[PDB]
Design a protein around this nucleic acid. Sequence first.
RNA 1: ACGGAAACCUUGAUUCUAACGCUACUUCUAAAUAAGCGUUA
Length: 51
Amino acid sequence: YSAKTNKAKPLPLYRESISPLTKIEFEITTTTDEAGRLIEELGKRAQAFYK
RNA sequence: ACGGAAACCUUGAUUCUAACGCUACUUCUAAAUAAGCGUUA
């Protein structure tokens, strides 16, 4: 989608993708204190990055 | 027709017994298989 053309143009690039609304679990391990603050702040940093 | 003749420096003996080329040590450290879609129509 181009902001200049103001329309969406399709391209020959087809991918195998996970469908929307799929639940996938990850485990994250932290061995120090600073990284613990970083990972406990993964939300509100994701929000700041998205803002 | 010689201070000469005859006479083994010889027999039996394991350079042998015991003794770990052993003790400790992460092939380890960061890293989205990902980015760009212009211009014409």
